[PDB]
Amino acid sequence: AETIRTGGEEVFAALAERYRHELRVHLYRMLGSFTDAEDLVQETLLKAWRRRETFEGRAGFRAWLYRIATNTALDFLGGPARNREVASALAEVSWLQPYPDRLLDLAAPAAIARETVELAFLAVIQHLPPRQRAVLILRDIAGWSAQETADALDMTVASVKSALQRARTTLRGRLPERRSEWGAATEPSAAERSLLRRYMAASRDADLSALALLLREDARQAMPPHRLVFDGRDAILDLWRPVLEGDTAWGEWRSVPYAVNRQPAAVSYVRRAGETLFTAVNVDVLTVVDGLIAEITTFDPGLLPGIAPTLAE
Template structure:
C-alpha cells in the first residue's frame, strides 16, 4: 500500500481513492454476489461499499490491507441488507398451462453470474485453509446453498473456506471472537456438505490433478451443451430428456416452480416447447457460474439465460433464468 496515495485519498483526492480501490472492485462484486445470490443486488451493494469506504477512509488506520478493509465493509453491508429483508422478485405468470411442480423453490431471487465477470480477477493466493477455488465457489449449487444458510454462517464460510482468511481476520471482520467463528463455521459446513457442490475439491493435494483434467471436463461439457441446444431448439423433448440423469432438476428463477426427475421435467418441457413451437427459438452459447450456458431468444426477443449443470455425459440440472440478459 502506497502511503502517499493513501494520504491523498484521505485528504479527499478521488483519483487516489480510485487507485486504492479499483483493483479490488471485481472481486468485491463476486463477494457480494455470493452473499446475496443476485447480481443486481450485488452491484448495488458494491456501490454502497465504495461510498462507505470513501466516507470511512479518514478512520482507516492501516492495520490491515486495503483489500481486507474493503472486504470487511462489503461483508457487513451485505449482512445489513439481508437483515433489512431481501428484495423478492414478483412471480412471473407463464403464458401456457404449467404442470404441477414437484416443489416450490425458496431461492427465487437467484440470478446467473456471467463468466466474463470472472475474467481479470486479481491473483490472490487463498490461505492454506481455503477449501474452494474461485470457479467452484461460483457454481449455482454453491450459491444456492449459501442462500439457504443464515447470513452470518454464509459470510463465515465465504471468508474462511473460499477466501482463506485466518480465523483472527474473520473474527475482526465480523466483530466477534475466534471461538464464535469456529462454532459458526462448523454449523455452516454441516449445513453445506460436499455433496451440495458437485465440483468441490475438499483437499489441497488433489488440486493439481484436477486442474490438469479441466480440458477434458470442458470438452465433455461442450459436447453435452451442443446436444442439448440441438434438441432444445428443435423442440425434441425426448432428446433433451435423454441427456438428463434420473434425479435431475429443472428450475426457473424467479418462478418458484421446480421439477424433479425425468417424468416431471418431460411434462413441463412438452407444455413449454408446444408454446414455443414455430416462434423462432434460438440459443447462443455462453458461460455463467463456471458452467455451460445459453442466452435464449424467442421471436427475436430476449428469453432469458439457460445454465446447465453437467456431470460426465449427462445433465443433473437445467436452470432457466427469466427476465435476465448478458
C-alpha cells in the same frame, strides 16, 4: 499504498478500482444477486471514501474494503433483506441471478473456480444465517484466518470456529459432492460445451428423444425467480413437449451459448407465427456430470443484466 490514502485523495477510486471486481463477487456469494452485489460495491466504495481515516494499516486496503463490504452486506441482510433466509434451495432463492464468466474473469483475487460460484453452492449458502455466511465465505473461500474473520465480524475466535462448523455441516449433506476436477473448472469443459450444443440443438429441432438422452433420470429444472421446480426427467419432458410439439408449439427456436458461474449455459430464443426476429425466452444454466444434465437452472433474460432481447437468424 500504506498511508498515501488520507494525504493523497483522488487517487482512491483509482486504487479501489483494483479491488472492485473481487469485492463484487464476494458480495455476490453473500447475496446471491448480481444487481444487489453491484449496488453494494458502489456503497462500499462510497463508504470507504467517506470513512477514509479509519484505515490504520493492519491488513491492507483490500482487507479493509472486504471488511466494509461484508458488514454492508450484513446490514442489508439484517434490514430490508432480513426475510431472505431459506429454511431445492435453488427453487426457493427467487433473488438468485447468474454471474457471467466474462465478468468472473475480471475478478480473480488463479481464476475463480466453479467450486466457489456454482449456482447450487450459492443457493445452499442462502440457507445459512447471514453471519454464518460471512464466516464460511471469509474462511473457506477468501482464505481469512479465524482471527482475521473474528476481527472483521466483531466476534470471538471460538464463535468463528463454531459458526464455521455449523456452516460446513449444513453445507455438506445439502450440497452434492463434486469431483475435485469438476469443482476446479474455470470455464465449461470441452465435453460440457459439446453437450451444450446437443442441448441447444434439441430445441432448434424439436427433438425430445435427444433431450431425454441428455437428462439424468433424477434431473431437476428449477426456475428460482418464478418459484417453480420440475423434479425428474419425465417432469422436464412433460414441460417441454407441448412447447416444442404439436398444435401448442410456440414457434421456431435458436440459442446462444452464455457461460455463467463457470457452467455451460444457453440463452434460448423463440420466433412465433408472424414475427421477424427471435425473442429471448430462457437463460438455462446446466449442471453437467459425466455427459448428463443433473440440473437445469432457468432464469428470465429480461430480469437480468446484459442479454440481447432479440436475434436475427
